[PDB]
């Protein structure tokens, strides 16, 4: 048995918003039994914690005071020190430890980046805040739901398609060093989604607009000389706002920890789409 709850829900929503604004950045000390003298020698990490599986848990910062002279100087090292030594219930993805897998992408103190190859402010006064990627649903602690990112990646058909049979089948698709260097700086993406989680167009329209990373992959498969579905890929990415929604903010190239330039790739894709639209009229006549 249930009844209409528009009024109760509305009042609760407004009141909760006001209170949260009053009590934003809620913080709970991991170990309150710390003399303020000791905290002079220890740096403070504010780690976002949230366990939606537990019905009684709510998001909150947890404060950990750690001696930075016990582990190497990287965000992942500090996170794992906290997990192993202080609280082993902390959750985070980590495979490669050398910035290759791209699993550890998190909001390392105000900037999306891989936690394994990013240092942290050594100063003991300013606190460090570690939170998950911004606009991604949070599963537990620093683990977000990147499923939609992969689903979008699947829609670009990232596999070499060729319309012309190989002449002899005992050779390799010819490609000069120039047609290979055309891909240099473009195939190194590790699909970390750090850039795409920083693109405002991706904030507003996660589904209709592919991220900067996926569009960069489409560009990689387009510029590749061995594939023959150039126009087909261009047309496929030209639908609705799969690409048109990009506003050339340029944050994608700024955040990329690998040093890639997805902004330039998207710009080239836009130019190619414009030329495709024009010459669909100019050529066929």
């Amino acid at each position: 048995a249930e009844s209409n709850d528009a009024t109760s829900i509305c009042l609760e929503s407004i009141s909760g918003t006001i209170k949260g604004l009053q009590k934003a950045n809620y913080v709970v000390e991991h170990n309150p039994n710390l003399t303020s003298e000791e905290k002079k020698h220890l740096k403070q990490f504010l780690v976002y914690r949230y366990n939606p599986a537990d019905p009684h848990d709510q998001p909150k910062y947890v404060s950990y005071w750690c001696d930075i002279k016990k582990f190497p100087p990287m965000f992942l090292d500090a996170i794992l020190y906290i997990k192993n030594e202080l609280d082993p219930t902390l959750s985070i993805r980590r495979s490669c430890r050398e910035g290759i897998c791209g699993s550890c992408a998190v909001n390392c103190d105000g900037l999306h980046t891989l936690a394994c190859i990013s240092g942290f402010n050594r100063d003991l006064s300013k606190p460090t805040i570690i939170t998950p990627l911004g606009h991604m649903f949070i599963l537990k602690d620093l683990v977000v739901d990147m499923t939609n990112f992969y689903a979008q990646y699947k829609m670009i058909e990232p596999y070499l398609k060729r319309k012309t049979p190989k002449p002899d089948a005992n050779k390799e698709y010819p490609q000069s060093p120039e047609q290979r260097a055309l891909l240099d700086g473009l195939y190194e993406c590790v699909l970390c989604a750090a850039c795409s989680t920083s693109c405002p167009s991706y904030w507003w329209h996660p589904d209709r607009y592919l991220g900067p990373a996926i569009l960069q992959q489409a560009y990689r498969w387009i510029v590749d000389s061995r594939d023959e579905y150039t126009q087909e890929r261009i047309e496929r990415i030209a639908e609705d706002v799969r690409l048109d929604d990009c506003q050339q903010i340029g944050m994608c190239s700024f955040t990329c920890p690998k040093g890639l330039n997805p902004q330039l790739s998207l710009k080239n894709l836009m130019d190619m789409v414009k030329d495709f639209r024009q010459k669909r009229i100019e050529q066929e006549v």
């Binding site: 167009s201 507003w204 329209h205 706002v241 929604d245």
Partner: protein, 44 residues
């Protein structure tokens, strides 16, 4: 111009996502008709 206004409203307002491209086109046609009527009538 009109296209840009519609694009901004679609990208910023979640509710406006409900409208199809067909409804947007109908609004476009009505707006063009009203603009033509306005231009013509003001000179009468």
């Amino acid at each position: 111009m009109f296209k840009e206004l519609i694009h901004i409203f679609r990208t910023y307002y979640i509710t406006f996502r409900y409208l199809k491209k067909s409804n947007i086109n109908f609004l476009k046609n009505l707006s063009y008709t009203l603009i033509a009527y306005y231009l013509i009538i003001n000179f009468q």
